[PDB]
């Protein structure tokens, strides 16, 4: 499967996405620190094969064709700033989310 640009991801904290909107991308104007999350991004993990203990998880959660890790963009360690401008470019065919 592809990657998820939505905020819906695990291993987070109120400090993990308290500045993000409901669709992963940081606000325009949110004054961030060094090491926060700007874009939340989750990617796929292992495929292998359907295990005996995960046979019920093969198809029982809509988008259960992919796994979930963590590869969100972060401010590189050291720099502050204020997000002034956000661009979102979409390859044609892909579903535009609510912020695009």
């Amino acid at each position: 499967g592809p990657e998820e640009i939505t905020a819906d991801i695990p291993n987070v904290g109120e400090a993990a996405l308290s500045k993000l909107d409901e669709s992963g991308i940081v606000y325009i104007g949110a004054e961030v620190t060094g090491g926060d999350i700007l874009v939340g991004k989750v990617t796929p993990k292992g495929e292998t094969q359907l295990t005996p203990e995960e046979k019920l998880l093969r198809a029982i959660f809509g988008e259960k064709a992919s796994d979930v890790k963590d590869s969100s963009l972060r401010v590189p360690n050291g720099v502050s700033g204020t997000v002034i401008d956000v661009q979102v470019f979409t390859r044609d065919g892909v579903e535009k989310d609510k912020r695009a």
């Binding site: 819906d8 019920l56 998880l57």
Partner: protein, 213 residues
Amino acid sequence: MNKEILAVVEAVSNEKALPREKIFEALESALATATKKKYEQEIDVRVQIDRKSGDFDTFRRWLVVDEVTQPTKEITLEAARYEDESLNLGDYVEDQIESVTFDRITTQTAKQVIVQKVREAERAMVVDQFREHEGEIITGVVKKVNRDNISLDLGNNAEAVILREDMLPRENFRPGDRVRGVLYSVRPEARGAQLFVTRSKPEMLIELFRIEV
């Protein structure tokens, strides 16, 4: 009533003889756990098991008592006077509901918690399996070597721990060897039933001679 859980109930490769319904509750609270952190407490293992439904909506409880301990699960008869004294002393009358914890996201953490619940169920099953025998003259093969402990691997995915205090002083065992003895631990151990054998007791060689003659 999508009927996905109905056919998901009858998988049923490994949880046929195991409590099916309990595994749905397990997986349902596991879908509800994962990314919950607000609410009031946590979730609720207890949930109206409606076989037909399949996706039993996690319902809460009120537990009628005559006491003031477990605040979100406390009723009295004076509070039952508003229900016209219909409640009796000691009942677990449910008067509340709960929801789910989400999306894209929270569901591989729900996969992860689904796995956690499945693991707990498997531990319970292993405990029941070890209780079936309750200590016998079974053999095994060493696989790992811990500090003052020997790990053994039997059949049907079963592992036993050999204490060094219940072992011989000079006689030292290693991996690849096959030893046989009588276990004496299947009840309270640690997260299930750690098969603890004792190859040094007398009853140990009671059927050892019986195996020969």
